[PDB]
Nucleic acid binder design. Structure first.
Ligand SMILES: CC1=C(/C=C/C(C)=C\C=C\C(C)=C\C(=O)O)C(C)(C)CCC1
Ligand SMILES: CC1=C(/C=C/C(C)=C\C=C\C(C)=C\C(=O)O)C(C)(C)CCC1
Ligand SMILES: [Zn+2]
Ligand SMILES: [Zn+2]
Ligand SMILES: [Zn+2]
Ligand SMILES: [Zn+2]
Lengths: 10, 278, 308, 9
DNA sequence: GCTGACCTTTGACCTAG
DNA sequence: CTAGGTCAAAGGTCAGC
C-alpha cells in the first residue's frame, strides 16, 4: 500500500 | 644550477631564466591575471616581479589557458548516529525498517528528489541496507549477530531452521571482513549511501540525478579515505568490493523471505510484508 | 601546411601532412588508448594559437583530416598491468581481430533449445573454459598457490569471466555477440543456443558496458580481480588471496585514471559492474541445472565440472 | 576432478 | 587565496630501416 | 623520408599555512 509513502509523508 | 631570482634549487630554464618552481608559478599567474629576494624572503610584487623581468623572464613565453562540500562525510557521520530465530530476525527487520525510512531523510539530497523516486530507491535495496546495518553492528561478537532488539543469534540455534548457510555467508563475507579491516561508521554510511542511490532501479523517474548523487558519494568517500587512511593505498577499492558480496547475500536472503512468505508459516509484520510485495 | 592546426609540416605523417606536435599527439593518443572529453560544444577550432583547449577536439580534427589509426604501431605496479594485458590478449582474441561469420539455425524467433547450436556452443564453451584456466595460469603468483584454492577460485569465477568476455564481444548496431572462432549470433540465436532467461539480462549487461569504454587491459585486470577474490568460500589461504588481489585493484585504478583525465570517477563504476556480474553468474549457475534435463545426451565434462 | 589436476600439473 | 613541491604533457630533435 | 623514442620545458593540481 502506502505505508512507507505515509511514513515519509510527515 | 641555482635559481637566478631567489637562489633556490633549479631543474632548468623557465621563460628564459634559470629559476625555481615558486618564481615560475608566480610569474605565470602574474602574467595571466595581469627588497632582497632569496628563498628565505621571496614572499612586494615589484621586487619579486621586477627581478623576474630584470633577469630576463619573457611574458610572451606564457601560453594561453589550457570531506567535500555537496556530499560531505559530515552528513553521514550525523546519519549513522541519528538512527543507530527467523521470526526474531523478521521482527528486528521490521523495527529497523522505520529507522531506515528515517535514515533516508538525513542524506543531503535525498529529500529534494521526487515522490516516486523516494519509494523506489528505498524499497529497492532495503535488505542490503539493513544487512549492512547489523553486519557492521556484529563486529564485537564472534560467531553471532546482534539485532536491533538486543538479541544475540548464533551457532546451531541460528542454524536450526535450515537457515545456517546464509548466516555463515553474512558472518564470513561481511562481518569478519568488516572487523578485519576495521571499517568506520562513516565508511559504512557511505557504502549504504551507494546502495541507496541505485540508478539501475526499475521505474525510476529521471535516475540521472540519483546516479549523480552516487558519483558525489564515490568522490567524497574516496577523498575521506585519502585523509583518514593515507597509509592504506587501496582503502577505497577494497571497501567498494564489499558491495558484490552484499548483493549476492541479499539475493538468496530475500528469496528465503519469499518462500517463507508464500508458505504462510512465519508471522511477518505488515511493514516488512510490504517490501516483499511489490 | 598542417591539416589539423595550420602549422609548418614536417612530412606526411600517418596519412596526411602534419607538424611534429600533432604527430606526437596522435601517436601518444593511439598508443595509450586515450579517452578525451571536451568541456565545450566539441566545436573548439584548433589552429596555431588555439591548440589544446580541448584534446577531444584536436584528436577529432586528426580523424576528420584523415589520420590513420591503423598506421600506429609507478613502473613497479605497471609491470603486472602489462603482464595481464598480454595474458588476456593471448587467451581471448579481441572482437576486431576475428573474421566473423554467421549461421541460420533457429535464427528468427525463439525456441526452447536448438540441439546443434547447443552442440557448437558446447564445444566453444569448453574451449573458452580451457583458455580461462590458461589466463589464470599466466597471472602473477596464481601458479604458486594451493591447488584446492586455485580450483576454488576458478570454480567460483568461471561464469563471471565468461559473461564479461562474451559481453566484450557485443555489437550494438546488430545486437549480436561473437565467439572465439568468429561465430556471430543474434539475441534470438543466443537464446535458442541455451541462454534462455539469462539472455535478456546478459545483453543488458553488455549495454551497461558500452558507456564505460573498457579496453583489453581493463577487461583483463577486471577478470583477474573477479578471479582473485578473498571472499570465496572453502578457501584454505584466503588472506593471501586478498593480498594477491590488492595490487590488481591499485593497478586497475592507476590505469583507468591514466587513460581518463577528465573522468576520474570511472574506476568505482567499472569496479562496481562486478555487483551485477555476481547476480548474472549466480542465476546462470542454476541455468545449467535447468539445461541438464533439456539435453538428450549429457553435459560436457569441463562445463559441469567447472559449473558444479 | 581429473581435468583440473591434469591441466594444472 | 596565494604559494610551491610534485606530477603530466608537449614538441623539436634524433636514429634506423 | 617517415616511423618510434627522448627529455627540457611548458602545463596542471592542491595540502598547508
Ligand atoms: C540476513 C538474515 C535475514 C534477513 C534480514 C533482513 C531482510 C533485514 C534485517 C534487519 C535487521 C535484523 C537489522 C538489525 O539487526 O538492526 C533472514 C530473515 C533471511 C534470516 C537470516 C538473517
Ligand atoms: C558455459 C555456458 C554458459 C554461459 C556462457 C557464457 C556466459 C559465455 C560464453 C562465452 C564463450 C563460450 C566465449 C567464447 O566462445 O570464447 C551458460 C550459463 C549459458 C550455460 C551453458 C554453458
Ligand atoms: Zn626562485
Ligand atoms: Zn618592495
Ligand atoms: Zn599540427
Ligand atoms: Zn573542445
Amino acid at each position: 500500500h502506502k505505508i512507507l509513502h505515509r511514513l515519509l509523508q510527515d | 644550477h641555482i635559481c637566478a631570482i631567489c637562489g633556490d634549487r633549479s631543474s632548468g630554464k623557465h621563460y628564459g631564466v634559470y629559476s625555481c618552481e615558486g618564481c615560475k608559478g608566480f610569474f605565470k599567474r602574474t602574467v595571466r591575471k595581469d627588497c632582497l629576494i632569496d628563498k628565505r624572503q621571496r614572499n612586494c610584487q615589484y621586487c619579486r616581479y621586477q627581478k623576474c623581468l630584470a633577469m630576463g623572464m619573457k611574458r610572451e613565453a606564457v601560453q594561453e589557458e589550457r570531506a567535500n562540500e555537496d556530499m560531505p562525510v559530515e552528513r553521514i557521520l550525523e546519519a549513522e548516529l541519528a538512527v543507530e530465530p527467523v521470526t526474531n530476525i523478521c521482527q528486528a527487520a521490521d523495527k529497523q525498517l522505520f529507522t531506515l525510512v528515517e535514515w533516508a531523510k538525513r542524506i543531503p539530497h535525498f529529500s529534494e528528489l521526487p515522490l516516486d523516486d523516494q519509494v523506489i530507491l528505498l524499497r529497492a535495496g532495503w535488505n542490503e541496507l539493513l544487512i549492512a546495518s547489523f553486519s557492521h553492528r556484529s563486529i564485537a561478537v564472534k560467531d553471532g549477530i546482534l539485532l536491533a532488539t538486543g538479541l544475540h543469534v548464533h551457532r546451531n540455534s541460528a542454524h536450526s531452521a535450515g537457515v545456517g548457510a546464509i548466516f555463515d555467508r553474512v558472518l564470513t563475507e561481511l562481518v569478519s571482513k568488516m572487523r578485519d579491516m576495521q571499517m568506520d561508521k562513516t565508511e559504512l554510511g557511505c557504502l549504504r549511501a551507494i546502495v541507496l542511490f541505485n540508478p539501475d532501479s526499475k521505474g525510476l523517474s529521471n535516475p540521472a540525478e540519483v546516479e549523480a548523487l552516487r558519483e558525489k558519494v564515490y568522490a567524497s568517500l574516496e577523498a575521506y579515505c585519502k585523509h583518514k587512511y593515507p597509509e592504506q593505498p587501496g582503502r577505497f577499492a577494497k571497501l567498494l568490493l564489499r558491495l558484490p558480496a552484499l548483493r549476492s547475500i541479499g539475493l538468496k536472503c530475500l528469496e528465503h523471505l519469499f518462500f517463507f512468505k508464500l508458505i504462510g508459516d512465519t508471522p511477518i509484520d505488515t511493514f516488512l510484508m510490504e517490501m516483499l510485495e511489490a | 601546411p598542417c591539416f589539423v592546426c595550420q602549422d609548418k609540416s614536417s612530412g606526411y605523417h600517418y596519412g596526411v601532412s602534419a607538424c611534429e606536435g600533432c604527430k606526437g599527439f596522435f601517436r601518444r593518443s593511439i598508443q595509450k588508448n586515450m579517452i578525451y572529453t571536451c568541456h565545450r560544444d566539441k566545436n573548439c577550432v584548433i589552429n596555431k594559437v588555439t591548440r589544446n583547449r580541448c584534446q577531444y577536439c584536436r584528436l577529432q580534427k586528426c580523424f576528420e583530416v584523415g589520420m590513420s589509426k591503423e598506421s600506429v604501431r609507478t613502473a613497479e605496479l605497471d609491470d603486472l598491468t602489462e603482464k595481464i594485458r598480454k595474458a588476456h590478449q593471448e587467451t581471448f582474441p579481441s572482437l576486431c581481430q576475428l573474421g566473423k561469420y554467421t549461421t541460420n539455425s533457429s535464427a528468427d524467433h525463439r525456441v526452447r533449445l536448438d540441439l546443434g547450436l547447443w552442440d557448437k556452443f558446447s564445444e566453444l564453451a569448453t574451449k573458452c573454459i580451457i583458455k580461462i584456466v590458461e589466463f589464470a595460469k599466466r597471472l602473477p603468483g596464481f601458479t604458486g598457490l594451493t591447488i584446492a584454492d586455485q580450483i576454488t577460485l576458478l570454480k567460483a569465477a568461471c561464469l563471471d569471466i565468461l559473461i564479461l568476455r562474451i559481453c566484450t564481444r557485443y555489437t550494438p548496431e546488430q545486437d549480436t555477440m561473437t565467439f572465439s572462432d568468429g561465430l556471430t549470433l543474434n539475441r534470438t540465436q543466443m537464446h535458442n543456443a541455451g541462454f534462455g532467461p539469462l539472455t535478456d539480462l546478459v545483453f543488458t549487461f553488455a549495454n551497461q558496458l558500452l558507456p564505460l569504454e573498457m579496453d583489453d587491459t581493463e577487461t583483463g585486470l577486471l577478470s583477474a580481480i573477479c578471479l582473485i577474490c578473498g571472499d570465496r568460500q572453502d578457501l584454505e589461504e584466503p588472506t593471501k588471496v586478498d593480498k594477491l588481489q590488492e595490487p590488481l585493484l591499485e593497478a586497475l585504478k592507476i590505469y583507468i585514471r591514466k587513460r581518463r583525465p577528465s573522468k576520474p570517477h570511472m574506476f568505482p563504476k567499472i569496479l562496481m559492474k562486478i555487483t551485477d556480474l555476481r547476480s548474472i553468474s549466480a542465476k546462470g549457475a542454476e541455468r545449467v541445472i535447468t539445461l541438464k534435463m533439456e539435453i538428450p545426451g549429457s553435459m560436457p565434462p569441463l562445463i559441469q565440472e567447472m559449473l558444479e
